[PDB]
Symmetry: C3
Subunit: 72 residues, 3 copies
């Protein structure tokens, strides 16, 4: 879970409209590119946690699969 990614998505949304209405535009485009980068970084942190969480589940289910096989 991360609500920061949501806040970054809305922040790039506001910066996008300000660029579209202005189309100082170069500063809003550079500022917009920093917003997208922060969101990509925030997603990669959450995407990294989902990778570690999938590995944990694969180890937990394999321990159960091997347990039910050893009982026989």
């Amino acid at each position: 879970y991360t609500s920061r990614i949501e806040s970054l998505i809305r922040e790039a949304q506001n910066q996008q409209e300000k660029n579209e209405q202005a189309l100082q535009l170069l500063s809003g485009i550079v500022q917009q590119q920093n917003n997208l980068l922060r969101a990509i970084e925030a997603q990669q942190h959450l995407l990294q946690l989902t990778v570690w969480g999938i590995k944990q589940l694969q180890a937990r289910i394999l321990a159960v699969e091997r347990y039910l096989k050893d009982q026989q």
Copy 2:
């Protein structure tokens, strides 16, 4: 699963070449930034579903782990 993210990736790909060949460029750069934002939003929706799906699995495997412990 989401095939929309793929379509958005190809759409930013076409807009990238049009900007690289043009390098009206400001409009293609603003249009490109909206494409990347849509893809980031589409990935966050899929990344959100993968978070809920991992929690469900952790509850399902914990129910099985506790079941095999209660049987003893």
Copy 3:
């Protein structure tokens, strides 16, 4: 796992500072937009693998859930 996404995040980080200090800027902005696109594509590949991995776990845990029900 993918360390390429990390390298792409740092590469967009270096390009962001070069754009912020320059604020030839148009070329750095187009070059920055290609960096973010590569990272979005690299995350979607990893996000796709996490989707296939969650489906596999759901099938493995359902096989165990059905096994413990058939034993009764």
